[PDB]
């Protein structure tokens, strides 16, 4: 059974937070909220639906960090003319994933930016 301030769903515990934090600070904060804590991860649509609803029910319309970071840094970025990728001029260094509390769609945001978030751990 989850802590009084958390919500239970299929054997896991979830809790949304309103403190604006960047991705890294949010993830770190989650590890400190309970043993095995992390930013929420969606292993299925059912789980995602539960979390989105919880977030909206608690704080209304806002954006919430999910547990995915540096999502394109390992991708195979290549120049169409096959030129070697040496020089770099990225406007943003890293992107992270979040959801807007009105639906369960995955969205991207620079990891350095702020957002609310949802923590999760296995009960």
């Amino acid at each position: 059974d989850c802590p009084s301030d958390w919500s239970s769903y299929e054997g896991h515990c979830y809790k949304p937070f309103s403190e604006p934090k960047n991705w890294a600070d949010a993830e770190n904060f989650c590890t400190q909220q309970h043993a095995g804590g992390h930013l929420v991860s969606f292993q299925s649509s059912e789980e995602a639906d539960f979390v989105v609803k919880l977030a909206f029910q608690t704080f209304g319309h806002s954006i919430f960090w999910m547990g995915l970071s540096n999502v394109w840094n390992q991708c195979n970025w290549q120049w169409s003319n096959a030129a070697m990728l040496r020089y770099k001029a990225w406007a943003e260094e890293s992107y992270c994933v979040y959801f807007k509390s009105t639906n369960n769609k995955w969205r991207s945001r620079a990891c350095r930016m702020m957002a609310q978030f949802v923590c999760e751990f296995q009960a």
């Binding site: 993830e27 095995g36 992390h38 930013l39 991860s41 969606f42 292993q43 299925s44 649509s45 995602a48 547990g67 995915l68 970071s69 540096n70 999502v71 394109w72 840094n73 390992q74 991708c75 195979n76 970025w77 290549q78 120049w79 169409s80 003319n81 030129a83 070697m84 990728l85 040496r86 020089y87 001029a89 990225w90 406007a91 943003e92 992107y95 994933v97 369960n104 769609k105 995955w106 969205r107 991207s108 999760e120």
Partner: protein, 129 residues
Amino acid sequence: DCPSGWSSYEGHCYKPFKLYKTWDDAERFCTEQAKGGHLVSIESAGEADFVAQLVTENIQNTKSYVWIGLRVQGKEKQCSSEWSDGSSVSYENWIEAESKTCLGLEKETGFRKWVNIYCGQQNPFVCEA
């Protein structure tokens, strides 16, 4: 030397187009504008500066984004493969437009920085040969 309408910079020829095409269409279009043509490849700060100047002088609308040739060559929506809790990323639910695996130049950053944007967006661009 470069054809009329094209501009020369360190051995290559560049040309901006005020045509709005998706990344794929723009890239294909560029391969037909000159032998060996492609969306521009920014390989140095100087080239980045040369292209920035070319864009400012030819692409009026400062609201537009300008395609460059660097993009994720693969089908992945993300390449992390793992959540912060250590579990694998299987289920996904991206809005395709949120998987910004293409890059464009824009006014706010002086057309010198690469901004992650949706590949299906129709934007003006620069070809290089």
